[PDB]
Amino acid sequence: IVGGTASVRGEWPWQVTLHTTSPTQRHLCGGSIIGNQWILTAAHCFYGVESPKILRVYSGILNQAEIAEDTSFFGVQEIIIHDQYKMAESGYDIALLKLETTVNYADSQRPISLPSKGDRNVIYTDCWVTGWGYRKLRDKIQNTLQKAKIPLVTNEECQKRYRGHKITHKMICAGYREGGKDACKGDSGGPLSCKHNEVWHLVGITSWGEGCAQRERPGVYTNVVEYVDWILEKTQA
Numbered sequence: 243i244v245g246g247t248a249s250v251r252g253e254w255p256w257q258v259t260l261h262t263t264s265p266t267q268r269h270l271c272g273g274s275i276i277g278n279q280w281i282l283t284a285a286h287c288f289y290g291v292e293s294p295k296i297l298r299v300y301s302g303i304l305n306q307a308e309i310a311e312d313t314s315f316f317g318v319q320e321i322i323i324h325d326q327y328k329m330a331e332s333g334y335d336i337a338l339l340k341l342e343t344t345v346n347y348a349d350s351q352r353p354i355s356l357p358s359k360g361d362r363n364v365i366y367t368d369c370w371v372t373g374w375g376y377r378k379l380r381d382k383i384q385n386t387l388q389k390a391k392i393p394l395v396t397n398e399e400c401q402k403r404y405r406g407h408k409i410t411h412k413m414i415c416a417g418y419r420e421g422g423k424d425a426c427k428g429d430s431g432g433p434l435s436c437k438h439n440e441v442w443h444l445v446g447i448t449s450w451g452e453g454c455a456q457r458e459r460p461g462v463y464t465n466v467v468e469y470v471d472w473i474l475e476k477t478q479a
C-alpha cells in the first residue's frame with residue numbers, strides 16, 4: 243500500500259495473508275474471508291501455482307512477524323479460478339480458495355459481506371484498500387498491515403486514464419487524480435472495503451494498475467458485485 247498507515251489490530255478482520263511455501267515461505271497475496279471455508283482473492287495470484295499444497299492462509303494477522311513455523315494456518319483444499327480468466331488486465335481476475343478446515347469466527351477473524359445487486363446505485367464514500375504490499379513500485383513486503391482511504395472513480399473517468407485498456411463494467415477503479423495513495427505489489431487479491439450505513443462491503447479485489455500511486459492512474463479492482471452469482475454457484479456444493 244502506497245501512502246497509507248498502519249492498521250489497528252483487528253480493524254480488518256476479513257483480511258488474510260496468503261503465503262506460498264515454495265521455495266521458502268513468503269507472503270504471496272491478500273484475500274478476504276467471505277465464508278467459513280472460503281477466501282475470495284485474485285486469480286492472477288496463482289501464476290505458476292500448480293497445487294494448493296504449497297499454500298497457507300493466515301487469518302487474524304496484523305504483523306507478518308506474528309507468522310512463525312509454529313503459527314497455525316489454514317490449508318487450501320482447492321483453488322477455483324474463474325473459467326474466463328486469462329490475465330488481470332483482461333478482467334475476470336477472481337478466484338476462490340476452499341479451505342481444508344473451517345474458520346472459527348472471532349473479533350480477530352470474521353467474514354465481510356458481499357455487495358448486493360441492489361447497491362449498484364449506492365455511492366460509497368468510505369472505501370479503503372488494505373494489504374502488506376509495497377510502499378513504492380520498487381520495494382518489499384511490509385510487516386504491518388497498511389490501510390489507505392481511497393475514493394472510487396467512475397468507469398468513464400477510469401477509461402480515460404487507461405486508453406490502451408478496456409475498463410469494463412466488471413471492473414471498478416479507485417484513486418486520487420493526483421495519486422499518492424494506492425495498492426501496490428503484494429496487495430493483490432486484497433479487499434477494497436467500503437462502509438455504507440454502518441456495514442462493511444467487499445466492493446472490489448485488488449487487481450492491477452499502471453505503476454503504483456501515480457498521478458492520473460487509478461487502481462483497478464475486480465467489481466465484486468458482478469460476481470455474486472458466480473460466487474454462489476462455485477461455493478454451493
Ligand SMILES: *[B@@]1(C2=[C][C]=C([C][N]C([N])=[N])[C]=[C]2)O[C][C]([C][O])O1
Pocket residue numbers: 270271286287375424425426427428429430431448449450451452453454455460461462
Ligand atoms: B499483486 C499486485 C498488486 C498491486 C499491483 C499494482 N496495483 C496498483 N493499483 N498500482 C500489481 C500486482 O500483488 C501480488 C502480485 C502477485 O501476482 O500481484
